[PDB]
Design a binder for these strands. Structure first.
Lengths: 146, 194, 63, 103
RNA sequence: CGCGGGGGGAACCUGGGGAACUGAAACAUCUCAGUACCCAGAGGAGAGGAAAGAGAAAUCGACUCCCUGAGUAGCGGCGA
RNA sequence: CGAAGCUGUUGGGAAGCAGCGCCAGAGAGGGUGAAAGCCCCGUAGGCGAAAGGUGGGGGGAUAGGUGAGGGUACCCGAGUACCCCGUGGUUCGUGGAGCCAUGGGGGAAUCUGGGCGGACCACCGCCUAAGGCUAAGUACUCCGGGUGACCGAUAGCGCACCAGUACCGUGAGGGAAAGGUGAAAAGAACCCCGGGAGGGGAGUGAAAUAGAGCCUGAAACCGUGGGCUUACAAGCAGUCACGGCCCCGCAAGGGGUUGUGGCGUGCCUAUUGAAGCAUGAGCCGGCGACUCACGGUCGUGGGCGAGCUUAAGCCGUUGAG
RNA sequence: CAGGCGGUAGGGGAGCGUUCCCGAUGCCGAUGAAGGCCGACCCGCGAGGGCGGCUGGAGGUAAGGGAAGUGCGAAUGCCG
């Protein structure tokens, strides 16, 4: 196009606001009976309630609050067969994931649903579904080791 | 394009079975173009703002006016509001649109006729009226307004003041003026970027 | 300034992938009874049928 | 304001972008740029005393600051200031020209 | 006798002394803070710096400035 | 060094138009008697720095520094680490609380030695303090410069007119209003009223409703002069009905303003509740208050879409990327 | 054509003026822009907008969309 009435594809609106006037809703606020407003405003998150805010509960998860850190066990994860059914070449735990989808892993656990093309995909921990899908129906690897 | 060596060209590769989405074209283009403008706006108030003389007259009574903090809620230069503030909000994006945009435009500007040369000789790639010999012997003249890219520093100290056109060097994006204009030329299909 | 999720709440509760507010009620932990004969058991973990789906928000940065 | 204008008396000549005619300029100073070369129509209606020419008022004057000037061109078009590599008295000694170094 | 050095300089350095209000919709533990201020030597840099480290890896490799890690790990009427 | 024409005609004045000439790695701007590239300073570009001197890089580079393998065999940073309590910090309010300084006493060792992987013994792994130096890559700003979706001087820096001055204060210190003739003062000569003042003709003058509390100059306020109006009278005061009186429209009617009369409880708050002797409003001008940062949420035009986005940097950037 | 129609808060729809952007090496303008006194014509439902005279004496900004210290009777507000 050019410089002609570029009116921003239909719905555009800057939807600002304003101080006030004498045309309608404008120049009011809205409330009073409930005393909100503060030069240094409440916040305003959910601090209200003034009733233990349904927080008369208790901490159950005991997997935190120590001092240095938490538990540390190399990327524990999984997988499905329908996500890469695509091609193969070799289906290497880095050919894929190291390049593409999913992050790190010392322990790759295989699984899912589907029923695609199986063949010697390297793994560090399998699921039995794969086992029967590759017991005269496909090929498999070994595991970590170091 | 020429007559000296070749005589023929043209292409709509990019993606011709589409090239029809003006909607998004509008929105984004406009936004970045703004950005740049050195935004260094001031602010005055907060608590003290240049340590104020330290309060004044009492209250209950005072000089008739329940109020007495030299925050200065009246002086023309005292305790107001933070409209500006240095950060003039710096937002931007990638080539996802750098390409797509220049495409439909020029492609449509080709539905009007643009030109493309890619590489040539105008003369002593320096003098104003040398390239003039390339204005009336090329075809172009006062009206439609044109733009062109050539990365040789020769053309740089040559095009100097470009009344009617652009004159570029590296890799910018001045569709701006071209939007309100037309005519063009490029530096190799390579420079447009593969 | 960046807003930091409440570890407290995160130190206890869980949201079921689809916006739900559930955790283990309040009564059977230790069992303030003593006598020993009925009740002791009978309980699990529910949600909050009104405003909790609003609370979840302050925990959408850690999950 | 950069303290930088033009020549002096010697010869000089006015133009006619406000008055008319021409003359050998009289006393062009420097500071605010100003100067008055005999011509133009001016005179102050000063106080009537004996110290002055007697009657109140005065006489001669001009006034201006930026451009609006010219030099010596009886027949030829109009140039400005020439050059050299090894010519006249040492290498300098100019005074406006027709076509050479002097005229 | 020699140089110092007192003394001055707008922020910005380092360090040494170093509060309270306001929050928690009371308040004493926590907050603002090691902020504000006061003192001190200092240089355009200062200050900091060459490993008696990190931290789990058959590892990295002076100290400093930004980027993220994570606002997670955790401190905590683990409440704010 | 700096680039590159005028001329005529109306026009106060030409930077007004036209018929055509022009330089241009220099058509950034600033200005000259009315909205100029070619007209004063400049603007791309490059000459260049000193004698004075003076701040520093590359170059060169001087005193100051730089081999190894094996057997003998003693020596290497203390009231120090290591205990403890009283610990500050570290995210760490003692908590299972390790590591640095330790304040207080106790108190070793020297390489088959000595600190640590957050208590303590058993395997493993990195370092050698108790002497100290050490630039860069970093912070900051009066002021130099640019530029500012910086403001245009009741803004703004507190103040651009001599203010940190008037003034106040005991001190400490507190702290002010006040920009603007014109293009050029070219600034009123002279005579008449006359105390100097202030006036008037007249003059310089495009304009003195341009003249010195001088740009253009409104509002609260101030009447000379003008028209409609008033002494039988009950009034939030304006209204509308008709009608009347002086203005323009040939006309049809358009004004102004009231005569009688029907009509007439105002307002901004506050609130089961108002017209309101329950608040506030001396009056006009001007100044006056929910933006923004970053973060979060749910919508929206949207691109791509199992894919979808890159932080700070290195180059490039008048400017862009 | 049935319909609807006071409506404080409130939450929806549009628009209205008003200062800085680019369109501005574009265009109106001393055969007046900005300001202002007058209007009892032309459009807006209004928000406002035009247009014409007169005073007034150097700048202004299309359509357009881009930003928003703005939409000001007062607050014994602040100033003159």
């Amino acid at each position: 196009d050019l410089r002609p009435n570029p009116g921003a594809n239909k719905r555009r609106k800057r939807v600002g606001r304003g101080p006030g006037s004498g045309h309608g809703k404008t120049a009011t606020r809205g409330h009073k009976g409930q005393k909100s407003r503060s030069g240094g405003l409440k916040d305003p998150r959910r601090f209200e309630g003034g009733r233990s805010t349904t927080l008369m509960r208790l901490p159950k998860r005991g997997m935190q609050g120590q001092v240095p850190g938490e538990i540390k066990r190399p990327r524990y994860q999984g997988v499905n067969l329908k996500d890469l059914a695509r091609f193969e070449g070799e289906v290497t735990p880095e050919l894929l994931v190291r390049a593409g989808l999913l992050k790190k892993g010392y322990r790759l656990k295989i699984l899912g649903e589907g029923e695609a093309k199986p063949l010697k995909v390297v793994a560090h921990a399998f699921s039995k579904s794969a086992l029967e899908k590759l017991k005269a129906a496909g090929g498999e690897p070994v595991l970590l080791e170091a | 394009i020429p007559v000296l060596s070749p005589s023929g060209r043209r292409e709509l590769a990019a993606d011709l079975p589409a090239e029809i989405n003006p909607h998004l074209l509008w929105e984004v283009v406009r936004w970045q173009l703004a950005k740049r403008r050195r935004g260094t706006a001031s602010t005055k108030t907060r608590g003290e703002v240049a340590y104020s003389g330290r309060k004044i007259w009492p209250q209950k009574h005072t000089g008739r006016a329940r109020h007495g903090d030299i925050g200065a809620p009246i002086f023309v230069g005292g305790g107001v509001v933070f409209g500006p503030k240095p950060r003039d909000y710096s937002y931007t994006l990638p080539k996802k649109v750098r390409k797509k945009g220049l495409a439909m435009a020029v492609a449509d500007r080709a539905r009007e006729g643009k030109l493309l040369l890619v590489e040539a000789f105008a003369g002593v790639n320096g003098k104003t009226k040398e390239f003039l010999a390339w204005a009336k012997e090329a075809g172009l003249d006062g009206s439609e307004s044109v733009l062109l890219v050539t990365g040789n520093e020769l053309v740089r100290r040559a095009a100097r003041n470009l009344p009617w056109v652009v004159t570029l060097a590296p890799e910018g994006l001045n569709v701006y003026d071209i939007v309100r204009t037309e005519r063009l030329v490029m530096d190799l299909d390579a420079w447009e970027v593969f | 300034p960046k807003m930091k999720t409440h570890k407290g709440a995160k130190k206890r509760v869980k949201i079921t992938a689809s916006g739900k507010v559930v955790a283990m009620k309040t009564g059977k932990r230790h069992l303030n009874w003593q006598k020993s004969g009925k009740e002791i058991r009978q309980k699990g973990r529910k949600f909050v049928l009104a405003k909790p789906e609003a609370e979840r928000i302050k925990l959408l940065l850690p999950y | 304001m950069r303290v930088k204008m033009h020549v002096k008396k010697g010869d000089t000549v006015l133009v006619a972008s406000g008055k008319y005619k021409g003359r050998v300029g009289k006393v062009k100073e420097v500071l605010p740029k100003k100067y008055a070369v005999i011509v133009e129509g001016v005179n102050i209606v000063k106080k009537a005393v004996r110290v002055s020419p007697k009657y109140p008022q005065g006489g001669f004057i001009e006034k201006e600051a930026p451009l609006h000037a010219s030099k010596v061109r009886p027949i030829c078009p109009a140039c400005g200031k020439p050059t050299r590599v090894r010519k006249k008295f040492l290498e300098n000694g100019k005074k406006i020209r027709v076509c050479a170094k002097c005229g």
